[PDB]
Amino acid sequence: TDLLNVCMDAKHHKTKPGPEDKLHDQCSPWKKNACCTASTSQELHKDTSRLYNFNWDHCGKMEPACKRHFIQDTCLYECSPNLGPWIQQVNQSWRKERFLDVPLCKEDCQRWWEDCHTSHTCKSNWHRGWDWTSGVNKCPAGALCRTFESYFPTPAALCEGLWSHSYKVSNYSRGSGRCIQMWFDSAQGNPNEEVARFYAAA
Ligand SMILES: Nc1nc(=O)c2c(CCc3ccc(C(=O)N[C@@H](CCC(=O)O)C(=O)O)cc3)c[nH]c2[nH]1
Ligand SMILES: *[C@@H]1O[C@H](CO)[C@@H](O)[C@H](O)[C@H]1NC(C)=O
Ligand SMILES: [Cl-]
Ligand SMILES: [K+]
């Protein structure tokens, strides 16, 4: 119960979730109850935003169909008040907590992978090892640009590995209430509230 409606202790996160009428674009589905501020939501839509100086186009321009998923993931990461059950203490410099093994809906993972499989990257883990000497992440020594499929032969590889096991792939479907959706419309509420509620009780 102490795992429901909480914000993890990380760089830009608010202390406690609450309404944010002004959440920008892709993050707007979180507007009734968010862990991110309007400002965070607008900045995260920008290329190489000031949140992390992370450049999605480290291997040329990433296709929009692909980039929207990375934006969506960052919406979830910054805004979701429904990941408490997967929050772990990590004592890193830019976050005391992160989430780990969030049961991501199979199809969200599949779609992410399919939409990105033509785009390019130089690394299978995007958390550690970038060349930051320019102030923005660049491909480090030994890292060649390749298709996403090269670094991520399956959707599970992408969803599980790219952010250091933030997610595990869940064998449940999107409306099931047994897996976290990265994409949702929420007109009838945030579907992930029920998911957190369920796993908290296990
Ligand atoms: N699910 C999810 N998880 C995320 O983390 C995330 C992010 C943040 C990504 C990010 C990547 C690299 C570094 C960075 O600067 N890395 C350094 C080392 C960092 C350190 O000191 O620990 C590097 O080695 O390149 C810092 C932050 C955006 N969307 C996300 N979605
Ligand atoms: C995943 O779900 C499908 C049905 O949707 C099922 O056939 C399969 O057995 C499941 N996988 C596992 C390992 O349970
Ligand atoms: Cl489409
Ligand atoms: K959520």
UniProtKB/Swiss-Prot annotation:
Primary localization class, coarse: membrane
Topology in the lipid bilayer: Lipid-anchor; GPI-anchor
Cystine residue pairs: 7-35, 27-75, 36-79, 59-145, 66-116, 105-179, 109-159, 122-139
Molecular function GO labels: folic acid binding; folic acid receptor activity; signaling receptor activity
A GO term from the CC aspect: plasma membrane
Residues involved in folate binding: 73, 77, 94-98, 127-132, 166
Entry's Gene Ontology BP terms: cell adhesion; folic acid transport; fusion of sperm to egg plasma membrane involved in single fertilization; inflammatory response; positive regulation of cell population proliferation; sperm-egg recognition
Tissue note: Expressed in placenta and hematopoietic cells. Expression is increased in malignant tissues.
Induction summary: Up-regulated by retinoic acid.
Superkingdom of the source species: Eukaryota
Protein purpose: Binds to folate and reduced folic acid derivatives and mediates delivery of 5-methyltetrahydrofolate and folate analogs into the interior of cells. Has high affinity for folate and folic acid analogs at neutral pH. Exposure to slightly acidic pH after receptor endocytosis triggers a conformation change that strongly reduces its affinity for folates and mediates their release.
Family named by the database record: Belongs to the folate receptor family.
Protein name: Folate receptor beta
Organism: Homo sapiens (Human)
